[PDB]
Write a protein that binds this ligand. Structure first.
Ligand SMILES: Nc1ncnc2c1ncn2[C@@H]1O[C@H](COP(=O)(O)CP(=O)(O)OP(=O)(O)O)[C@@H](O)[C@H]1O
Ligand SMILES: [Mg+2]
Ligand SMILES: [Zn+2]
Ligand SMILES: [Zn+2]
Ligand SMILES: [Zn+2]
Lengths: 171, 178, 84, 557, 107, 97, 271, 112
DNA sequence: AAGTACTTG
RNA sequence: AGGA
DNA sequence: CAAGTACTTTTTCCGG
């Protein structure tokens, strides 16, 4: 998982910033946009690497307004979750439907039907828990889950997982 | 505006196939083992493991603070509080993604140091496996070569049960304490 | 994909067209409260400032001259001559 | 003006032409377009789920578009569609459809001639997509039989089979909208004497065109992705949205629907006639009859100015205004709306000449400079001055008409309860009056010259004429006998530069046309300069002293 | 080269393409009476070898199409025995420069 | 007033590239359409108060751009499509030449 | 019609005249590469006159006692006499001037001497005279090597196409040919000395002025010659109408030409 | 090449008929424009407008719609290299002032 | 209509 | 219908 | 190979 992808944003600078602290604003405006971003195309963009060596290139001045468009060629750390990818995470929430698990930037939810039978909901616990013949999953519990599917949403790739299969479940 | 990559494919009119993505090593149209870095040159995919990843970000976020105080001139629970501070100095804080990620890594990391992570990277990157398989072995710990060949189904025939067992053995030996 | 500064063949002198666009562009910038690269010796008009900026050859602009085939030669206002 | 869109801005680098795929038309369509009823959902004024806004664009102006909530300006219009009861030829390709038949087999859909004929493999070698389809056609038009066996590229003794299909090919000729062929025949070796005269149906030609090989049609004019032959024959009709066919609604309860809105309703009507006719008790002749009518409507919608007479005149005597007609040159989309345009920031008045103006200056009346506006940006090197123009208002000459904030909201200095107390901010625009020494484009139609349009320095004067210098009469050609002239006002500090730096009158002094000056001294001066420069001419001290003062750049000597 | 008095029958004319790499040409005796080339209006036309042509295209940053053209049937093309794709360098006098060199590709 | 075809001529003769564009666009027509990147058509159902884009038919939601063109072109284009012709507009290249 | 046919034609940054496609119409705009305003109908002295007149104006013979330049013209006038090494240059000069005359008689077959060429050399020298205050009594501070060579080397800098290769370099030579015939005609030693009576500085200034003024006189890539030409023919046509052997001429003939009409009104042979 | 001569020789004699003067380079260009194609290319809707330039470019004169019909049908691609093609797209045409591009250079910018 | 282009006799 |  | 049929613009801008 977690990749190092080479990307490029096209930023348009108002001529008001045509001072020497321009490369500085441009580099800053990149991380304003790109860092903390989330596309289905590349996944969660988490960190722009090598701040010092980010390339600015020559900026084209735009025909009828002063603004100049630069193509910022850069490199960053991404996280694009896939189906079939087995991921370790910590539980967040727990309902009579299943339980959500935080995995790095994103949350993966496991239905009651995506867990075994033995493991069954218990409303009567602070906080709510899924109790098994040998185990118990509550709120802060450590779990290894298999992503069954991904739903590429707004500014968050959410997913659905399984702990029913062999070698999955609590850890 | 939005971010784009080096993959220049000119998909004129012809929309589809939108072929799915599984750990049957069928990754993206962005994540091919053959992906050209901006220098123009062909490069391989860079897949990081939890710890290989923590040490990449921790690194870039340190050198960012190194350039921020330059231009401004004119133990797990203990590393978690340490990192949560470095984010406040370098990142916009609005990047709640990186905050969780750094905690997730700091907790789920298999190897504490860039020397131990170095060693892991040798052992694995010899097998001749796709970087996604290689990362998933160093990312999460197994026991039966079956635990691995089942969680990383992409392997299966890719290696000897015995070989993977020897690698898995030497991985748990490199496993840095917490 | 470009031409190296040593293999350049285009007029070493600025064309009437380039001049009018560099002057226009700097004026359009100066007006949009852009940073003025010279001492405005009591100057108030951005085109008069852009003329001064160009006379002192203190304009930060580069003219990408495209050849018919596609490739181009990159030239600076500083490196161009002005007989116009 | 038009509100901020998060989309990345770009410029059109390529225009890839093609044909609409009946499958594409259906996808991209925000509605069909089931009713010839314009709207008036049971007479109750609003729109119907049939023609105009069955999810389309929007009328009412007070009704936000029912798809993209945008509405009116900002919203384009959303395309529609109508499934045609039977296929119909597109008026334009009518003869290319014919020419394609003249090239292919009317049964198997394979080229009548191929790589085995020498002249063919040679005509196939033409690189051009048109010149090659030109040769291919002339060659194949004469081949009246689909060949089963052809003598090999060696001997006349070994006749090897290419494509099969024996079939005797027709002799296609148009009958105005309709294609009718005449099959050679055979009866007792000869025949014709009396052949076979059957009309080729849109529906069959459609099917034949479907069967034409990619490699095949690709060697003819066509392309596999953008323009397949099968797309010259219409199955799905794109229904243009309101901004193309506007409802010019005079007063309240009075429709005002566009001509194309009628021709579409006419096509709708004609389709519902044919659809019911064939689903129900088919009187056969009455179908092939109501068919030909729908093929006609679709024709005269796109092109009403056809050979086969009927100009499908709108009941008022006046013919129906085709889409072809809409775009056809000198006025009409291309020549008159795109290549040439009616423009804002323009002035025209009677011209008179002044001998006390500089060559490069143009006298502009007080009204004309108070009318015309320049967008000055609140910069520190004017802030104070611009505030006084704003204080001056839009009725004093050196004044301003509007103040446009960063917030893109227009302040009308002419009314606005604040035109007195209005404190300007940097980055704002003050739409100020045209002032002395601003550049302008003075023009005199015809304009058969680079010199028939020149940049002049404004000089705001009294009296309702455009006063220009006399030595600049010769290039415009204009005299002062009831002569009128145009004047355009630049908007960009970049455009001002454009004018002053390349267009200016002193620049146009030496004409490239004839490598000689195009302006000179004329009339009063030309005659007086002869009079002044003879040996007989002598001037008294009194006058010399005045004449010397008259030269602006006199030394004092 | 074949010099024919009045005509060459369609029968014989079929044999012109028959023997490549060798090439055959037909010139009517009556056309050859006067030399066109010698005329006031006709300038110097010069054949370009593959080497020269490739260089001309490299130097002017061209495509074979982008070059001005000469017909294969052009009186001068026939005279010099131009083949399709061959380039001619045209040297005319000039009231502007003195000498001007143009190039025409054969189609 | 009319900035006629004839008047566009001499503007081109002058070299006044920007001023001619400015005349045709800013002092007239000047529209902002949203075009799809797959099929270069004005099929974009740009709900720009919500930054939702989309060109159904192309299934798109990502490859969409904005363009500034005369309202008459926007029209001509719609008029051409109304007649089964596709003027697909692309903000990229392919031929190079 | 013209305007529509020619719109897309302009001079690019390679000084080549091309269209929408980029196909070459002309390799150098107007066979010379000069802007049309910068030209003046100058006179080629070398072309006309008697073969004897020619000799009297251009021939310098340091070997002949009566064909040397008298020491009233230059200072070296006494010590210059006989020098075989120098007479190589004045023989070199006179032989190139001869070549020119024979070449100009090749171009202008009628012998017309008045041709439009950039840089008014007459006016450069005229204006040099009042600038430096030329005394047509005192002798010049030039050497034969100063005049002969200075000219040779000004010719090097008269750049139109810039490229370094035989195609472009041999094409530069072509686009510049005629102006040099004029430059050599007006800057030959005997002319400079007897007629112009130029000093050293005066001459050195003349050269740098011709050079700089020439470099100005060239066309600006971007120059829209399609529309220019179309208008420079289209406007004159309109003034044959707004005013008023026997062959069809003017507005109707021009129509036949542009249309490339097969059936002319007055087909006429001239033998 | 002799046809070019006869072309200018005639074109020029039409202008010089009135007495008026036009600089070689203009008629020479037009004559050279007609000529280049390979033979005499009439300044008519069935000569130059029938050549292979732009589509929108060609359409802006005489066969407007008719040209556009063949455009869609043979799937013509537009260069947008032509003057007219940009005028129709509201793009700064690649002529005179727009025949090159302007860029800021952070190097020269921080130097001043 | 003038001029040409096209296919048809 | 009119104007240069 | 011959007429015959088929086709397109014809200056620019500016009040019932
Ligand atoms: N139909 C037209 N199209 C274009 N320009 C026209 C025109 N009619 C007239 N003009 C212009 O207007 C002028 C002629 O107007 P007229 O009524 O004839 C007075 P005039 O004949 O010019 O006085 P003159 O005898 O001193 O020449 C010309 O300069 C011409 O360019
Ligand atoms: Mg008049
Ligand atoms: Zn809408
Ligand atoms: Zn068949
Ligand atoms: Zn689309």
């Amino acid at each position: 998982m977690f990749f190092i992808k080479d990307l490029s944003l096209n930023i348009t600078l108002h001529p008001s910033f045509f001072g020497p602290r321009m490369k500085q604003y441009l580099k800053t405006k990149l991380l304003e946009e790109v860092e903390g971003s989330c596309t289905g195309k590349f996944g969660y963009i988490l960190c722009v690497l090598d701040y010092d060596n980010i390339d600015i290139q020559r900026g084209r001045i735009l025909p009828t307004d002063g603004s100049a468009e630069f193509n910022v060629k850069y490199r960053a750390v991404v996280f694009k979750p896939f189906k079939g990818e087995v991921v370790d995470g910590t539980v967040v929430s727990c309902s009579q439907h299943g339980f959500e698990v935080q995995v790095g930037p994103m949350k993966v939810f496991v239905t009651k039907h995506l867990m075994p039978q033995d493991l069954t909901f218990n409303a009567g616990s602070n906080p709510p828990s899924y109790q098994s013949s040998e185990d118990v999953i509550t709120i802060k519990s450590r779990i290894r889950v298999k992503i069954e599917g991904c739903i590429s949403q707004v500014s968050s790739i959410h997913a659905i997982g399984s702990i029913k299969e062999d070698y999955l479940g609590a850890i | 505006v939005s971010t784009s990559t080096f993959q220049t494919r000119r998909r004129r009119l012809k929309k589809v196939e939108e072929e799915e993505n599984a750990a049957t090593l069928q990754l993206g149209q962005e994540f091919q083992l053959k992906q050209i870095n901006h220098q123009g040159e062909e490069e391989e995919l860079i897949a990081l493991n939890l710890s290989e990843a923590r040490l990449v970000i921790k690194e870039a976020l340190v050198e960012r603070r190194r350039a921020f105080k330059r231009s401004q001139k004119k133990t797990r629970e203990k590393e978690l509080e340490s990192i949560d501070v470095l984010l406040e100095q370098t990142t916009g804080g609005n990047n709640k993604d990186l905050k969780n990620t750094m905690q997730y890594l700091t907790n789920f990391s298999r190897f504490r140091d860039q020397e131990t992570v170095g060693a892991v990277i040798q052992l694995l990157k010899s097998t001749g496996l796709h970087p996604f398989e290689v990362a998933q072995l160093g990312s999460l710990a197994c026991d039966t070569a079956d635990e691995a060949k089942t969680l990383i189904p992409s392997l299966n025939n890719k290696i000897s049960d015995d070989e993977l067992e020897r690698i898995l053995k030497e991985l748990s030996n490199l496993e840095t304490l917490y | 994909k470009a031409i190296p500064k040593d293999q350049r063949a285009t007029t070493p002198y600025m064309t009437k067209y380039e001049r009018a666009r560099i002057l226009g562009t700097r004026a359009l910038q100066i007006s949009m409260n852009a940073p003025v690269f010279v001492d405005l010796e009591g100057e108030t008009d951005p085109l008069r400032i852009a003329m001064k900026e160009l006379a002192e050859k203190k304009i930060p602009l580069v003219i990408r001259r495209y050849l018919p085939d596609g490739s181009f030669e990159d030239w600076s206002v500083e490196e161009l001559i002005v007989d116009l | 003006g038009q509100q901020y869109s998060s989309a990345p801005l770009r410029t059109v680098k390529e225009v890839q032409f093609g044909l609409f795929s009946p499958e594409e038309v259906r996808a991209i369509s925000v509605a069909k377009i089931r009713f010839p009823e314009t709207m008036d959902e049971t007479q109750t004024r609003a729109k119907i789920g049939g023609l105009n806004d069955p999810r389309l664009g929007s009328i009412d102006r007070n009704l936000k578009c029912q798809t993209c909530q945008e509405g009116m300006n900002e919203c384009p219009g959303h395309f529609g569609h109508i499934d045609l009861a039977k296929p119909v030829f597109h008026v334009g390709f009518i003869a290319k459809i014919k020419k394609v038949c003249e090239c292919v087999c009317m049964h198997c859909g394979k080229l009548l001639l191929d790589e085995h004929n020498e002249l063919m493999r040679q005509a196939l070698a033409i690189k051009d997509s048109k010149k090659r389809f030109a040769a291919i056609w002339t060659l194949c038009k004469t081949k009246m039989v689909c060949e089963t066996d052809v003598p090999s590229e060696d001997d006349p003794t070994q006749l090897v089979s290419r494509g099969g299909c024996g079939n005797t090919q027709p002799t296609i000729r148009k009958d105005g909208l309709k294609l009718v062929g005449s099959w050679k025949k055979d009866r007792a070796t000869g025949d014709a004497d009396e052949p076979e005269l059957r009309v080729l149906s849109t529906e069959e030609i459609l099917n034949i065109f479907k069967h034409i090989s990619v490699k095949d049609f690709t060697s003819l004019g066509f392309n596999e992705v953008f323009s397949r032959p099968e797309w010259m024959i219409l199955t799905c009709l794109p229904v243009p949205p309101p901004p193309v066919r506007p409802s010019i609604s005079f007063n309240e309860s009075q429709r005002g629907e566009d001509d194309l809105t009628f021709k579409l309703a006419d096509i709708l009507k004609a389709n519902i006639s044919l659809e019911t006719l064939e689903h129900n008790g088919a009187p056969h002749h009455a179908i092939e009859e109501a068919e030909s009518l729908l093929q006609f409507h679709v024709a005269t919608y796109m092109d009403n100015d056809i050979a086969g007479q009927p100009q499908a005149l709108q009941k008022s005597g006046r013919p129906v205004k085709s889409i072809r007609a809409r775009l056809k040159g000198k006025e009409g989309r291309i020549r008159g709306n795109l290549m040439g345009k009616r423009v804002d920031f323009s002035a025209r008045t009677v011209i008179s000449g002044d001998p006390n103006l500089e060559l490069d200056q143009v006298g502009v009346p007080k009204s004309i400079a108070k009318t015309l506006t320049y967008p000055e940006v609140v910069t520190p090197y004017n802030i104070d001055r611009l505030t006084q123009l704003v204080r001056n208002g839009p009725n004093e000459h050196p004044g301003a008409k509007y103040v446009i904030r960063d917030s893109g909201d227009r302040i009308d200095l002419r009314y606005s309860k604040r035109a007195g107390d209005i404190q300007l901010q940097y980055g704002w625009k003050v739409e100020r009056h045209i002032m002395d020494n601003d550049p302008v484009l003075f023009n005199r139609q015809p304009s058969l010259h680079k010199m028939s349009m020149m940049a002049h320095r404004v000089k705001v004067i009294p009296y309702s004429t455009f006063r220009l210098n006399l030595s600049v009469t010769s290039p415009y050609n204009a005299d002062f006998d009831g002569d009128e002239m145009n004047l355009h006002v630049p908007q960009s500090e970049e455009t001002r530069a454009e004018l002053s730096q390349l267009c200016a009158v002193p620049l146009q002094i030496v004409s490239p046309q004839s490598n000689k000056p195009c302006m000179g001294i004329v009339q009063d001066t030309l005659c007086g300069i002869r009079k002044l420069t003879l040996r007989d001419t002598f001037i008294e001290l009194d006058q010399v002293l005045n004449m010397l003062y008259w030269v602006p750049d006199w030394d004092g000597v | 080269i074949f010099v024919y008095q009045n005509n060459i029958t369609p029968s014989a004319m079929k044999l012109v393409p028959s023997i490549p790499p060798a090439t055959i040409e037909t010139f009517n005796e009556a056309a050859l009476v006067v030399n066109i080339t010698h005329h006031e209006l006709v300038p110097k036309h010069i054949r370009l070898s593959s080497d020269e042509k490739r260089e001309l295209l490299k130097r002017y940053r061209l495509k074979e199409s982008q070059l001005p053209r000469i017909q294969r049937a052009d009186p001068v093309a026939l005279y010099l025995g131009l083949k399709r794709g061959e380039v001619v360098k045209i040297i005319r006098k000039s009231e502007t420069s003195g000498r001007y060199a143009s190039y025409r590709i054969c189609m | 007033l009319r900035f006629g075809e004839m008047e566009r001529d001499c503007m081109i003769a002058h070299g006044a590239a920007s001023f001619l564009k400015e005349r045709l666009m800013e002092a007239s027509d000047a529209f902002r359409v949203h075009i799809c990147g797959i099929c270069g058509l004005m099929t974009v159902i740009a709900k720009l108060n919500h930054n939702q884009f989309e060109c159904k038919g192309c299934d798109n939601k990502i490859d969409i751009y904005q363009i500034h063109i005369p309202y008459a072109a926007k029209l001509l284009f719609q008029e051409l499509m109304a007649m089964n012709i596709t003027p697909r507009l692309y903000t990229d290249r392919s031929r190079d030449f | 019609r013209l305007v529509k046919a020619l719109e897309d034609i302009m001079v690019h940054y390679d000084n080549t005249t091309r269209n929408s496609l980029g196909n070459v119409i002309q390799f150098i705009y107007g066979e010379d590469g000069m802007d049309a305003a910068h030209i003046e109908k100058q006179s080629l002295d070398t072309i006309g006159g008697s073969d004897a007149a020619f000799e009297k104006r251009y021939r310098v013979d340091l070997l002949n006692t009566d064909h040397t330049l008298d020491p009233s013209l230059l200072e070296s006038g006494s010590e210059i006499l006989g020098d075989l090494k120098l007479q190589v240059l004045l023989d070199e000069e006179y032989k190139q001037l001869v070549k020119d005359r024979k070449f100009l008689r090749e171009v202008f077959v009628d012998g017309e001497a008045n041709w439009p060429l950039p840089v008014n050399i007459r006016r450069i020298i005229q204006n040099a005279q009042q600038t430096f205050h030329i005394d047509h009594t005192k002798p010049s501070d030039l050497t034969i090597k100063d005049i002969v060579l200075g000219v040779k080397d000004l010719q090097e800098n008269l750049l139109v196409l810039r490229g370094k290769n035989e195609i472009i370099q041999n094409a530069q030579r072509d686009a510049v040919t005629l102006f040099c015939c004029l430059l050599r005609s007006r800057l030959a030693t005997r002319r400079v000395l007897q007629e112009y009576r130029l000093t050293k500085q005066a001459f050195d200034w003349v050269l740098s002025n011709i050079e700089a003024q020439f470099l100005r006189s060239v066309v600006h890539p971007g120059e829209m010659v399609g529309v220019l030409a179309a208008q420079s023919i289209g406007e004159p046509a309109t003034q044959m109408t707004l005013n008023t052997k026997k062959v069809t001429s003017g507005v109707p003939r021009l129509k036949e030409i542009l249309n490339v009409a097969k059936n002319m009104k007055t087909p006429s042979l001239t033998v | 090449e002799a046809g070019r001569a006869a072309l200018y020789k005639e074109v020029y004699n039409v202008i010089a008929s009135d007495g008026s003067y036009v600089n070689y380079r203009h008629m020479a260009l037009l004559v050279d424009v007609m000529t280049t194609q390979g033979g005499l290319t009439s300044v008519t809707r069935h000569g130059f407008n029938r050549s292979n330039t732009g589509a929108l470019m060609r359409c802006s004169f005489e066969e407007t719609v008719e040209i556009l019909f063949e455009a869609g049908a043979s799937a013509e691609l537009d260069d947008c290299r032509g003057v007219s093609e940009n005028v129709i797209l509201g793009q700064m045409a690649p002529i005179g002032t727009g025949a090159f591009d302007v860029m800021i250079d952070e190097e020269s910018l921080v130097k001043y």
